[PDB]
């Protein structure tokens, strides 16, 4: 019978947001987490043990793999999804302490407002900033044959990837769900801008 303490808190945090934004944001988060957590991380299991190159020089594989993948995609998306959800839990833990400060007082405009919109700006700024770095570094497709020109390897070598087609589909999926989570925060911003 002690679960009525949460119905205050979840209603107080969403006090300025529309009804069509609360459910759509919540479902895409669980969707993102499950798709990241059961399907795609097994695809990136043998990312180094299956990477083979066409040479005899010892150590050529270690450097020609490292030039191709300065970071993996599954560790990139975790770094993305943590930075995206930091400001929401910040706002959540802040509102709890503010409610605790006023709860102590009554028995024994613009205060929380600006903090909300600033967090909604920062969530979208981080999202578009992570999209730009992925556009700059990797691209949005993966070829099957890579050409490597590092040391200690000789002149030019060919290396063959591991599942170049299965990774492309999840690349496009994580592009699309990130674009939708950006586009919906834009609408949530314009809904609270146009009230007054």
Give the residues lining the site for its own copies (CB under 8 A): 1-3, 5, 11, 19, 22-23, 26-27, 31, 34-35, 38-40, 42-43, 46, 48-50, 52-54, 58-59, 62-63, 66, 69-72, 75, 78-79, 82, 86, 89-90, 93-94, 97, 100-101, 144-145, 152, 158, 160-166, 169
Hey, how many other C-beta atoms are within 10 angstroms of the C-beta on 30? 9
CB nearer to its own copies: pick between 62 and 125? 62
Instruction: Single out the residue of 173, 182, 174, 184 nearest to residue 75, CA to CA.
Output: 174
Enumerate residues 6+ apart whose C-beta is below 8 A from 146.
Answer: 64, 68, 158, 159, 160, 161
CB nearer its own copies, residue 22 or residue 192: 22
Least distance to its own copies from the beta carbon of 75, Å? 5
Q: How far is the CB of 2 from its own copies (least distance, A)?
A: 5
Give me the least distance between CB of 71 and its own copies, in Å please: 6
d(C-alpha 74, C-alpha 78), whole Å: 6
Number of C-beta neighbours around residue 50 at 10 A: 11
Cβ 185 to its own copies shortest distance, Å = 19
Q: Which two tokens stand for residue 112?
A: 């929380």
Closer residue to its own copies in complex, CB, 112/163? 163
Q: What are phi and psi of 194, to 5 degrees?
A: -90, 15
């Amino acid at each position: 019978g002690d679960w009525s303490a949460l119905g205050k808190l979840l209603d107080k945090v969403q006090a300025y947001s529309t009804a069509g934004g609360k459910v759509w944001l919540s479902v895409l988060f669980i969707f993102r987490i499950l798709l990241l957590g059961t399907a795609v991380e097994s695809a990136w299991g043998d990312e180094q043990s299956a990477f083979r190159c066409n040479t005899q020089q010892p150590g050529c594989e270690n450097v020609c793999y490292d030039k191709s993948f300065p970071i993996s995609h599954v560790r990139f998306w975790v770094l993305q999804i943590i930075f995206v959800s930091v400001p929401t839990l910040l706002y959540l833990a802040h509102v709890f302490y503010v409610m605790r400060k006023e709860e102590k007082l009554n028995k024994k405009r613009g205060g929380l407002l600006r903090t909300y919109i600033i967090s909604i700006l920062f969530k979208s700024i981080f999202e578009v900033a992570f999209l730009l770095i992925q556009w700059y570094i990797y691209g949005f497709s993966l070829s099957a044959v890579y050409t490597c020109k590092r040391d200690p390897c000789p002149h030019q070598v060919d290396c063959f990837l591991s599942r170049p087609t299965e990774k492309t589909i999840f690349i496009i999926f994580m592009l699309v769900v990130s674009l939708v989570s950006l586009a919906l925060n834009i609408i949530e911003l314009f809904y609270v801008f146009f009230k007054g």
